[PDB]
Every structure is written in structure tokens, then in C-alpha cells.
Amino acid sequence: ETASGYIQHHLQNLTFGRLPNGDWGFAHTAEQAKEMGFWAFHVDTLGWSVLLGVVFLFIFRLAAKKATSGQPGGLQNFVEVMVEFVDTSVKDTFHGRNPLIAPLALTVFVWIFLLNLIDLVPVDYLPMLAAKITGDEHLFFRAVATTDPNATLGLSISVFALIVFYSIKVKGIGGFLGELTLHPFSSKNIVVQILLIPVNFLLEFVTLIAKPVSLALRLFGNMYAGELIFILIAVMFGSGMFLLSALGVALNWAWAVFHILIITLQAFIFMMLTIVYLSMAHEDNH
Amino acid sequence: ITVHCDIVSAEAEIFSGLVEMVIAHGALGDLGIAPGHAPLITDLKPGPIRLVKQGEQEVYYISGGFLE
Amino acid sequence: MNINATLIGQSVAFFIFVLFCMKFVWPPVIAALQERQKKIADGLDAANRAAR
Amino acid sequence: MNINATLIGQSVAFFIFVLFCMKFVWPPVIAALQERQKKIADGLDAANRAAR
Amino acid sequence: METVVGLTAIAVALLIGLGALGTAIGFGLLGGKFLEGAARQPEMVPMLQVKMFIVAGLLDAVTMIGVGIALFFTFANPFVGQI
Amino acid sequence: METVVGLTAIAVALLIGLGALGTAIGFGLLGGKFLEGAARQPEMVPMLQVKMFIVAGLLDAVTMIGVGIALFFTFANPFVGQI
Amino acid sequence: METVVGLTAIAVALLIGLGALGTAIGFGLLGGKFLEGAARQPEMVPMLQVKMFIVAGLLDAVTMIGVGIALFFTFANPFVGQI
Amino acid sequence: METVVGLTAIAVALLIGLGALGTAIGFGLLGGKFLEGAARQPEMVPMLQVKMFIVAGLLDAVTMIGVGIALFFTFANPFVGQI
Amino acid sequence: METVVGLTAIAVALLIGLGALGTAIGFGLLGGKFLEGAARQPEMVPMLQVKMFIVAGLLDAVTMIGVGIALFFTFANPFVGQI
Amino acid sequence: METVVGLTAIAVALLIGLGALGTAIGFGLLGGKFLEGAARQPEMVPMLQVKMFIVAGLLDAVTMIGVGIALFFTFANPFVGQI
Amino acid sequence: METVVGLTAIAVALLIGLGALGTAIGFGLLGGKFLEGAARQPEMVPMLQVKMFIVAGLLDAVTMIGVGIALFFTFANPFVGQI
Amino acid sequence: METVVGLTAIAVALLIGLGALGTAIGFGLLGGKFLEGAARQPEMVPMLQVKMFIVAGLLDAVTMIGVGIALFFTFANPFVGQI
Amino acid sequence: METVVGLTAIAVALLIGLGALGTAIGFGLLGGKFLEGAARQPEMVPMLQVKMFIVAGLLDAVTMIGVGIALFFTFANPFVGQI
Amino acid sequence: METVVGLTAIAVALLIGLGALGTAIGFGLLGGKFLEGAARQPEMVPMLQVKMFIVAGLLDAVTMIGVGIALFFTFANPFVGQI
């Protein structure tokens, strides 16, 4: 197998959706997408993103059934260290009394943590099960769920809808447009404020829209770069060359220690911004 | 050639005369002061202050203070 | 479709899992923190109470 | 042949890495996990002595 | 077609290379002041850490747009087809 | 013409790339001094946050014109019709 | 002709792009010193705000000339008639 | 085809070179403040060292996206597929 | 005179754009120190302002001749008469 | 072929030259702070020297990837084969 | 000789442009240190302003040589005579 | 063949020129703190001298590779044999 | 000959222009520390002024070699002789 | 010979330039700290001057190799001999 041949199959997602004649069929090429509407689903991505989501709630079902409220057992001690660290991380960020933020923070952090933890397994192993079950050697298939920009966008766009909703709900359409046009720059007279209303609109609308976009693309960028750098080091062995395969051992041994930072930081950034952004939608920041 | 140096404590004088170079331990780093230096006020570390007299050496242990 | 097909599935799933966990999974475990902390606090109070 | 040797290159790297990791990198984590359990037990015993 | 396709590779390298340069220097400046503030007044730390991540939302905002348009040019070139 | 659209891609990369480079470094310097002020005086943080945004709008003022002109050149090229 | 029109797109990218780069770094340096001065004496901030606006005008003076000439080259190109 | 292949080599060089340049300067700025904080408070060293690694993950973000895309363009090519 | 007229557009862009970059950075450095001084003691502001304008005249001196010859290249081009 | 071979020589110069530039400036910034700490606290030098080498490993990380790719291109060549 | 003419416009743009860039940054650094001393010791201003003019002569020396050569190449081009 | 040989001369200029630029700025930053430390601790200068030379080995490491590759291209050009 | 001649004008602009840029920033850095130090020691100004000139000769040493070689290339061009 | 001789003039300008730029900025950074040391502690000046010259040897080391190679490419030519 050539280095380009090894890489070329692994970069495509499994898509099923609406063909021009009806709601049935799988897509085979990138070009085919231009006639197609909004109505399709990535079959590989939905299975993998949901699987670890069920596992997080399953660990809570396993843990809640055996809570001692006293001396912790050997297994639950390790779970308490992880829970104590997450609770400490939330406490070192959130000081309010909102009931939605804490279960959201625990859910988001632990889900991203489990989805990131599986990045250590070989890229070629997981696709083969789906291919054999489908009976198709040409089946496109990507296992890692956080390395799709749609996963990070689904999380940031839905949180942004709550932020914008609470802001419009308590301040009204007239007040919301006032915030978007009479701040941060203001004046005691109308003739000077009218020259500032387009500048204020250009600043507040752009900065408001930049929050969900930067969250989704920053988190996607860091995670995609994480899987892509590990995949490229794996290609040294994948090349079939004697010298490059012999050389890879030294680099791989040095490189393996790095993943704990990605697991810790990427889950933490979504939490840190979510607590702040939902808190600033009920008060005047100007 | 020299500046008028005076080492003092709340109880009595420690030194008084003319010196060429003064080495003292400042709270954010050591100082090497000579005649004509612009005004300087600084908090001193507990340690030895070294004085130079026309090119002999003295050492005194101090529990902290201020150099002006 | 190459990339755009996942935009609708994840939005519904996230909002459901957060509200479901908030009502049927999260509350039963966090109550234990108020309890565990009180087990020690009652022990510390007992020491001051016995001496008094 | 060279194709089979590519799996050997991965295998020797993984085995020495797993050995080095579990024998020298991992032991401090085992110690940190069990020592916390010990401090919790010692704390609960001191609270139980005061109660009696 | 060749000059459009070849110059697009360079346009993609510039869109992302300049963003990589700016954010690495920018976070070196923002991050260096976080470590000094946290050493000078150690009790402020949890407030400082959340304030740093809020400012980090401004530091790369225009940069993520540059990376997003560079990815668009790489896989769905808009210039090719404009004759 | 292929030369004009290929150079337009380069023009767009310069417009967005230099603005990305400048804003990332510019916010590294403003946000580094806001964290220094917040660490020195936590009581001033509410007023300093408002004044950081007065100047945040001034960093982005010209770079926002650059990304606006770049998107115009990518989706409605005004040079192809000049012959 | 194609080369004079294609090189005009690059001229416009340099005029707005270099202005965007200088202005973003310049206000990063001036604004960071406005937050450090506001923390030093909160009672004089109304005076420091107006004093910064008079230097903001000097900082952008050549950058606003640059974007004015760039928009002129974009909509009323003076070079395609020198041929 | 030779122009697309030739310009891809320079695209790769710019994409890795600007990433290396920004990374080396960024860690020089961040690491320099870590050594100063360590010298001010010797007892805070383990807390500061952990905070330095947390900042390093944001500083080194877009640089790895660039290194990944650049290495991808050497062993695979999305531009040559467009003829 | 296709090449001469097209390279003149690039010459003008460098003269105004590279000058605008320098003055925006220069006034960020000079203006920041003027605000620092105004914040140090407000009673000296009338004196410090006159000293800032004296320095501003030295800072802008080569840039004002740069935009002067740039406008001399856009109107009354001197290179198209050297053929 | 000559273009692919000629442009890869410049790609190698960019990879090593930009890496050399960044690493030299990065160690000037890190090293200046290390000597400052050594003059401030001479008894802490054995510990601070180890903290400096921990940062030196991060500072050169992307630079050594770039130097490795450059030597691959200078001796072997992945582009010539692509024709 | 159609290639020499017009290409010398790039030479004069670099001679005046790089000179303007360096002189504007150089006076920002020199001027900032003059105002910093002046705001702390107004008694020294008459002496320090004279010291500033001594440095100004050395700071601009090579910039004025570049400006002179650029004007010479604009009105009495020596390269055209070399055919 | 003239393009391979001619582009090699520029590759050599970039290898040595960017290395000279980086090391001259890098030693200005490193050496400045060595003198600052020596003025504050003149009796610690033999210790500070050994610590400066240890950093000088890391600072100049990649530049020594660049100048070695540059000399190799001038006396035993590897690209001329690839065409 | 026309290409050699045109490129020698650009060589002269780079050779003088990069020197004008470095010398202006170098004296901005050197002269500002001289004005801060003169105000620190009004009694030592006669000595500090002489020490500034000791560095000024090292700072301009390579810049004057560049200006000398550039004046030689414009009035007695050695490349015109194919040597 | 036209291309190789023309690009050698550019190579010589980029070898003396960049090196002149780095050396001028580097002595501005090194010399500023020497004057800071001479104004903090006027009695160590004779020793500080010797320690400054030890660093000046490291600062110009690569710049002198680049200047040596530039003169070698001017009065001799290793490229013209390769055809």
C-alpha cells in the first residue's frame, strides 16, 4: 500500500440522504453534493457520537447504584478523583445559583473527555467492522466524532441560541436593537449618536456572531490537528519503506506522552466560555 | 571621588564617612552606587553591605531596612 | 453531501441529553456532596459540644 | 519481506513504550490514588473516635 | 486554469500562515501577563484564568475566519469556474 | 481572465492574512495589560473591562474593512470586467 | 489590459493590508497604556479618554489616506487610462 | 501541471515556516515570564509550570492545523486533482 | 508601456502602505508614553503635549515625502517618459 | 522539471531560514530571562537551568519538524516524482 | 530596454519605503524615552532635548542617503545608459 | 539550466541572511541581560559567563545547520543533478 | 543585459534600504537607553555620551559596507562584465 | 548568463542586507543595556565594556560569514562556472 493510498480512503465520511428523485440512497463522490439540498445524514458519525454519550450516562447509572456516602471502594475512589477534579474545575469558574449550567458543564466535559480518550486506537481497525457488516470494501467510514466541525457547531450554535434568546426575552426587540446601536459608543445629543449607530452595529453584530464561530472552529481546529498529527506519524510505518519504518520507532516513542493536554484543555475551554456567555445575557455589559 | 555614607539604626549610628562605592542588597535586586547617582529609595534585604574607600573590606549582618 | 449533513442531528441530541440528565441523572449524585460534607461537620461540632 | 517488517516496527515501539509507561511513568499515579483513600479512612476514623 | 489553481495554493498558505504567526505571538503576549499576574497576586488566579479565556475569544476571532475561508478554497475552489 | 482571478486570490489572502496577524498581536498587547491591571487592582475590573472594549473597536476598525473588501473580491470580483 | 488590472488588485491589497497591520498593532500599544493609566488614577479617566482620541486621529491619519486611495483604485482605476 | 506542483512546494514551505517562526517567538515570550515568575515565588513553581502547559495548548493551535495541511499536501494533493 | 504602468501601481502601494505601517506603530509607541506621563502627573500635560508634537514632526518627516512622491507617480507619471 | 527542482531549493531555504530566525530570537528572549534569574537568585540556578531546558524542548518542537522535512526535500524529493 | 524602466520604480519605492518604515519606528523608540524622562524630571528637559538631536543625526543618516539615491534614480536614471 | 543555478544563489542568500538576522537580534537580547546582571552582580560575572555560553549553544544551533547547507549548495550544488 | 541591469537596481535598493531600516531602529533602541541613563546620572553625561558613540560605530559597521557596495554597483557595475 | 548574473546581484543585496539590519538592531539592544549598566553602576564600566566586546564577537559572527560570501559572489562567481 502507498502512503497516498493509505490516506485517501480514511478522509471520507459515510453519507445517506435525498437524491433528486427521492429520500433513499448513499452518496459516492464530493461532486454529487452540488445538486443535493439540506436533507442528508453521516451514518458513521451519528453512531460514534451517540455511543460514548450513552456510556457517560451508563457510568452514572453504574456509580449511583453503589454510592456509599462514606468510605469509597477501590473502583469508586478513582471515579471520585475524576468527579472531585471536575467539581473543583466548575467551582473555580462558576459562583452563581443557575440550575442548568452545572448539569450542562458535567455532561459536556465528560462527553468530550470520553470522545477524546478513544483517539489512541488505530485508524484502520474501527472502519473494517462497518465495511464487513455492509458487505462493501469501498465503504467510506470515520470513527472519531469530535474531528467533524458539525459536532462542535451543534454544541456552540445551540448554546448561542439560548444566549440570544435570554437577551431578547428580558430586554425586548426595542432594547436588543438599542444595545446593538447605542453602545459601546454613546452621546448626549442625537446628531452625534446617529453617526455612531452604524459603527456600534458593525462592532456589536460582528463580535456577537464571532462567539459561536470561534468556539466551533477553534475546538474543531485543535482536535482535527490532534488526530492529523498522530495519523501523519503513523504514515512512516504505512509507507512500506525499510528506512522510514526503522526510523519511526524513535519518534513514536518520544511522541506518545503528549495526548493528556488535548483531553484536558479542549473539554475545559467549552465549559469556561459557556458559564461566562450565559451569565452576560441578563445584565447590561456597557 | 567619594559620597557621604551614613549607616543608622533606631538606637544608634553604625557608620558615617566618605566612600567611593557602596554595594547593598535591594528587595528586587542588588545595587552598586557611586557619587552623583539620581535619588533612589529602596527596601533592603537582610544581609551584608560592602563599602569601598579609595580602592580594605568590611561586612555587617543586618535584619532588613531601607537604603535612601 | 460531503460535510453539511450532520448540522441537524447533533443540535436536537445535545439539548435532549442536557435536559434529561438535569432531571433524571445529575440530581441523585450531587446531593451526596451536601451529606459527605455534613458527616465531617457534625463530627467537628460534636468535639466542640462535648468540651462545652 | 519488508511489508511484514512494518508491523514489527510498530510492535517493538509499542511494547517498550507500554513497559516504560506502566513500570516507571504510572506508579506515582497508583500512589496518589491509594494515598487519598488512606487519608479519607484516617479522617473518618478520627471523626468516629470523637463520636464514641 | 493552471495559474488560478497554483496561485490558490499560495493564497491558502498565506491565509493560514499569517494567522498561525499572529495567534502564536498574540497568545505569547496574553499568556506571559497571565503568569506574572498570577505570581504577583496568587489569590486572584481563578478570576484571572476565566478572564484570559474570555479575551482569547477576541484574539483569534478574525483568524478563524481566515482559516475557514482557506479550507473552503482548498476543497471547493470558488475562483475556478470564473474563466 | 485567469491571471486577474489568480492574483485576486493573492489579494484576498493579503487582506485577511495581514489583518489576522495584526489583530492577534494587537490583542496580545491590550489583553496582556488588562490582566496586569486586574491582578494589581481587582476592584477596578468592572471599569477596566468597559475601557478595553472602547479600544478593542479601534484595533478591528481597519481590519474589518479589509475582510469586508476581501469577501467582496471573492464573491463579486470587480477587476475581471475592466478588460 | 490584464497585467495592469491584475497588479492593481495587489496594489489595493497592500494599501489596505499594511494599513490594517499597522493600525491594529498601534492601538494595541496605545490602548494597553490607556488601561494602565486609568488604573493608576481612576478620577482622571474622562481626561485620559479625550486625550487618547486626539492621538488616535494621528495614528490613523495615513491609514485613512491609504484606504481612500485603495477604494479609488477599486472603483475608478486611474492606470487603465494611462495606456 | 508543473506550475501547480512547483507552487505546492512553496505553499508547504510558507505554511510550516510561518508556523515555526510564530511558535519559537511565542514560547520565548511565554517561557520568559515563567522563569521570572519562578524566580519571584520559588514555592509557586509547580502551579506556574502547570499553568504554562495550559496556555501552550492555545498558543500551539493554528500552527498544528498548518503543519497537518502542509504535510498532507506533500504525500497527497487536492490541487492536482483539479487539473 | 504595459509593464512600466503596472509596476508603478505597485510602487505607489509600497510608498503609501509601508509609510502608513510605520507611522501607525510609531504613534502607538509615542502616544502611549504621552498618556503614561499625563497619568504620572496631570499638571505637566500642557508641557508634555508640545514636546509630543515636536517629536511627531520628526516621526512623520520621511513618510510625508513618501506620500508626496506616491501622488507624483499616480498623476504625472515620471517613468513612462524614460522609454 | 527545472521549475519543480528550482522552487524546491527555495522551499528548503524558507523551511530552514524561517526556523533559524525564530529559534535564534526565541532563545534570546528565554535566555535573557534565565540570566536575569541567575543574577537575582544565584542559589536557584541549578533548578532554573532545568526549567529552561523544559521550555527549550517546546521552543524547538515545530522547528525540528521543519528542518527534518527540508533535509528530506534536499536529498530525496516527493515532488519530482509527481512530475 | 523596456524591462529596466518601470522596474527602477520598484527600486525607488523600496529605498524610500524601507527608510520611512525604519525612521518612523526609530523615532517612536527614541521619542518614548525622551517623554518618559521629561515627565519624571522636567528640570533636565533643556539638556535631554539637545541629546535627542545628537541621536537624530545618526538615526536618519543612512535614511537620507537612501532618499537621495531614490531621487537620483527618478530624475537622472543611471541604469538606462547601461542599455 | 540557468533558472536552477540562479534560484540556488537566492536560496543561499536566504539561508545565511535569515540566520544572520536571527542571531544578531538573539544575541542582542541574551547579551543585554548578561550585562544587566553583571552591573547588578559584578562578583557573579564568571558564573553568568558560563551560563550565557550554554544558551549561546542552543541559540546558534539551527543557524549553524543553515550556514552548513548554504556552503554545500555553493560548492556541491545537489539540484543541478536532479534535472 | 536589460535583466541584469534591472535586477542590479533592485539589489541597490535592498542593499541600502535594509541598512536604513536596521540603523533607524538600532539608534531608537540605543539612544532611548542613553536618554534614560543621562537622566539617571546628570553628573556622568560626559562619559555616557562617549560610550554611546563606542556602540554607534559597531551598530553602523555593516550598514556602511552595504552603502559602499551599493554606490559601487550603481557607478561601476561589475555584473555588466559577466563576472 | 543573463538570469544567473541578475539573480546574483539580488543574492548579494540580501546577504549584506538582513545582516546589516540584524546587526544594527542587535547593537541597539546590547548597547542600551550597557548604558543602563553604566548609569546604574558607573564604576564597573571598564569591565562591562570588555564583557560587551565578548558578546559583540557572538553577535556579528554569522553576519561576517554572510558579508564574506557576498564579496566572494561579487569579485568571483561560483554560479556562472556551473553554466
mmCIF file of C-alpha atoms in Angstrom, chain F residues 8-68:
data_model
loop_
_atom_site.group_PDB
_atom_site.id
_atom_site.type_symbol
_atom_site.label_atom_id
_atom_site.label_comp_id
_atom_site.label_asym_id
_atom_site.label_seq_id
_atom_site.Cartn_x
_atom_site.Cartn_y
_atom_site.Cartn_z
ATOM 1 C CA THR F 8 -7.346 38.288 -6.793
ATOM 2 C CA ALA F 9 -6.909 35.142 -4.619
ATOM 3 C CA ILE F 10 -3.479 36.519 -3.536
ATOM 4 C CA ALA F 11 -5.011 39.981 -2.906
ATOM 5 C CA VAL F 12 -7.693 38.349 -0.658
ATOM 6 C CA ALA F 13 -5.075 36.345 1.262
ATOM 7 C CA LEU F 14 -3.076 39.565 1.929
ATOM 8 C CA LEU F 15 -6.273 41.427 3.004
ATOM 9 C CA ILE F 16 -7.385 38.746 5.529
ATOM 10 C CA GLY F 17 -3.890 37.434 6.491
ATOM 11 C CA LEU F 18 -2.318 40.812 7.410
ATOM 12 C CA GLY F 19 -5.486 41.737 9.398
ATOM 13 C CA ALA F 20 -5.333 38.358 11.216
ATOM 14 C CA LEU F 21 -1.613 38.904 12.029
ATOM 15 C CA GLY F 22 -2.202 42.493 13.264
ATOM 16 C CA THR F 23 -5.290 41.779 15.449
ATOM 17 C CA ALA F 24 -3.759 38.680 17.088
ATOM 18 C CA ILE F 25 -0.635 40.664 18.091
ATOM 19 C CA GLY F 26 -2.693 43.814 18.951
ATOM 20 C CA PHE F 27 -4.989 41.890 21.351
ATOM 21 C CA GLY F 28 -1.928 40.122 22.845
ATOM 22 C CA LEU F 29 -0.687 43.597 23.893
ATOM 23 C CA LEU F 30 -4.047 45.126 25.069
ATOM 24 C CA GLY F 31 -5.204 41.942 26.861
ATOM 25 C CA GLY F 32 -1.807 41.481 28.463
ATOM 26 C CA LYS F 33 -2.093 44.937 30.147
ATOM 27 C CA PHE F 34 -5.754 44.345 31.196
ATOM 28 C CA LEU F 35 -4.693 41.209 33.110
ATOM 29 C CA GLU F 36 -1.815 43.168 34.713
ATOM 30 C CA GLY F 37 -4.290 45.888 35.856
ATOM 31 C CA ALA F 38 -6.822 43.259 37.056
ATOM 32 C CA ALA F 39 -4.071 41.495 39.087
ATOM 33 C CA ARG F 40 -2.895 44.825 40.664
ATOM 34 C CA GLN F 41 -6.432 46.120 41.487
ATOM 35 C CA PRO F 42 -9.361 43.595 41.425
ATOM 36 C CA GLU F 43 -11.797 46.411 42.459
ATOM 37 C CA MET F 44 -11.160 48.259 39.130
ATOM 38 C CA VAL F 45 -12.009 45.234 36.873
ATOM 39 C CA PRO F 46 -15.643 46.388 36.104
ATOM 40 C CA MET F 47 -14.460 49.805 34.774
ATOM 41 C CA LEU F 48 -11.321 48.452 33.010
ATOM 42 C CA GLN F 49 -13.450 45.870 31.096
ATOM 43 C CA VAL F 50 -15.568 48.691 29.596
ATOM 44 C CA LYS F 51 -12.456 50.707 28.589
ATOM 45 C CA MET F 52 -10.804 47.609 26.960
ATOM 46 C CA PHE F 53 -13.822 47.431 24.572
ATOM 47 C CA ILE F 54 -13.553 51.176 23.680
ATOM 48 C CA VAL F 55 -10.067 50.378 22.267
ATOM 49 C CA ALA F 56 -10.975 46.815 21.053
ATOM 50 C CA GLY F 57 -13.276 48.515 18.480
ATOM 51 C CA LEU F 58 -10.316 50.700 17.371
ATOM 52 C CA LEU F 59 -7.992 47.668 16.776
ATOM 53 C CA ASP F 60 -10.579 45.997 14.488
ATOM 54 C CA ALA F 61 -11.842 49.188 12.704
ATOM 55 C CA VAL F 62 -9.495 48.932 9.646
ATOM 56 C CA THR F 63 -9.112 45.103 9.693
ATOM 57 C CA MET F 64 -12.928 44.754 9.423
ATOM 58 C CA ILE F 65 -12.845 46.945 6.247
ATOM 59 C CA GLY F 66 -10.137 44.539 4.926
ATOM 60 C CA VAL F 67 -12.194 41.322 5.460
ATOM 61 C CA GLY F 68 -15.292 43.123 4.027
#
